[PDB]
Design a protein around this ligand. Structure first.
Ligand code: 15S
Length: 350
């Protein structure tokens, strides 16, 4: 019978929920019959990634228009879809592969979750909830609702909700202090690096077994580049709202998980438009996508040598940028130390 607190157990249940994995594969219009979660293999997901890479290649660099067809065919063969009577869309443009790349990105973390979940031995003195918690290799302490942390974190949530993301409201349900096994040592060199900021990373609940057990990761070479305004990196926002939208919560499932991450931003390569450099200029350690609105500098609180940008949104200088709001990207997974995981309730508009 579990030691773990009520909120933590609920979290463990939530991220190891086989049904949410299933639901999300359905949303992506995968064929569950030809492919169950058990069959979901790491090998094909990486193989299917390579096929995605063979497309995008060709297309505007080659393009046989019948080899493209065989490729699209090798894809849905590998990852069986179920459009029913409609046939799958041929993978013949960038926008087309972005969508299927993003999906593999999720199946990857889903495979991680289910692998984790159905792995291990049942010594069974401790109930599965204890077991599954230990599979995450992360310490998770509940942050007291009435503390100073909790109030700053809630202020960060309240103040940085964007003017144009008003399709819902955010209520913090639980706040977790998190410590990934080994991440301190990993982050250790970047701790001396200046300009360190507590920033938002939103993702779907089905990625958290993966995110907690392995950290925020970077897309490998086998993957495309489309949609990536600043390359293959780990992205963050200073507005809870920019990040929440990537939880992919609906009126039907209104509860989301978001991360607070300390990120060692160093000298930021400040940008206004999508240049895929990926290789920074020397003495630059991150990219900051400049936006029209920014959190308010006069309120950037500092704790334990780390900037919390809980200024409410005001006019940034920036003129002639495509960016909604700011956006921070690093290209080395070690520049990130996860600090908090928040259970968010999305209270949907009207
Ligand atoms: C590029 C991709 N980004 C996204 O899916 C969405 N994000 C980009 C835009 C953005 C901007 C500001 C804040 C956020 C984002 C989001 C992620 N959530 C953030 O709050 C990404 O960084 N991933 C991390 C790990 C990827 C990966 C894929 C394959 C693999 F083998 C290893 C890692 C999958 C997705």
């Amino acid at each position: 019978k579990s030691k773990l607190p009520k909120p933590v157990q609920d979290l463990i249940k939530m991220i190891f929920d086989v049904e949410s994995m299933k639901k999300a594969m359905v949303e992506y219009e995968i064929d569950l019959q030809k492919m169950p979660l058990g069959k979901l293999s790491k090998r094909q997901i990486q193989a299917a990634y390579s096929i995605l890479s063979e497309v995008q290649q060709a297309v505007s660099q080659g393009s046989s228009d019948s080899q493209i067809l065989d490729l699209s065919n090798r894809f849905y063969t590998l990852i069986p879809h179920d459009f029913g009577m409609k046939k799958p869309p041929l993978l013949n443009n960038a926008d087309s592969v972005q969508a299927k790349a993003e999906m593999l990105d999720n199946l990857l973390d889903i495979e991680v979750a289910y692998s984790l979940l159905r792995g291990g031995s049942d010594d069974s003195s401790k109930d599965p909830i204890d077991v599954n918690y230990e599979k995450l290799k992360t310490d998770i302490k509940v942050v007291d609702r009435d503390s100073e942390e909790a109030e700053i974190i809630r202020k960060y949530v309240k103040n940085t909700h964007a003017t144009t993301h008003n399709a819902y409201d955010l209520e913090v349900i639980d706040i977790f202090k998190i410590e990934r096994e080994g991440e301190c040592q990993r982050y250790k060199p970047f701790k001396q690096l200046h300009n360190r900021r507590l920033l938002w990373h939103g993702s779907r609940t089905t990625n958290f077994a993966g995110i907690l057990s392995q950290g925020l990761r970077i897309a490998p070479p086998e993957a495309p580049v489309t949609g990536y305004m600043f390359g293959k990196g780990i992205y963050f926002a200073d507005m809870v709202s920019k990040s929440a939208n990537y939880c992919h919560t609906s009126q039907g499932d209104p509860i989301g998980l978001i991360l607070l991450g300390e990120v060692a931003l160093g000298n930021m390569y400040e940008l206004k438009h999508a240049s895929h450099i990926s290789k920074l200029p020397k003495g630059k350690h991150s990219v900051k996508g400049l936006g029209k609105t920014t959190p308010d500098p006069s309120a950037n609180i500092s704790l334990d040598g780390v900037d919390v940008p809980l200024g409410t949104g005001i006019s940034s200088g920036v003129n002639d940028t495509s960016l909604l709001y700011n956006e921070y990207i690093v290209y080395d997974i070690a520049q990130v130390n996860l600090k908090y995981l928040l259970k968010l309730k999305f209270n949907f508009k009207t």
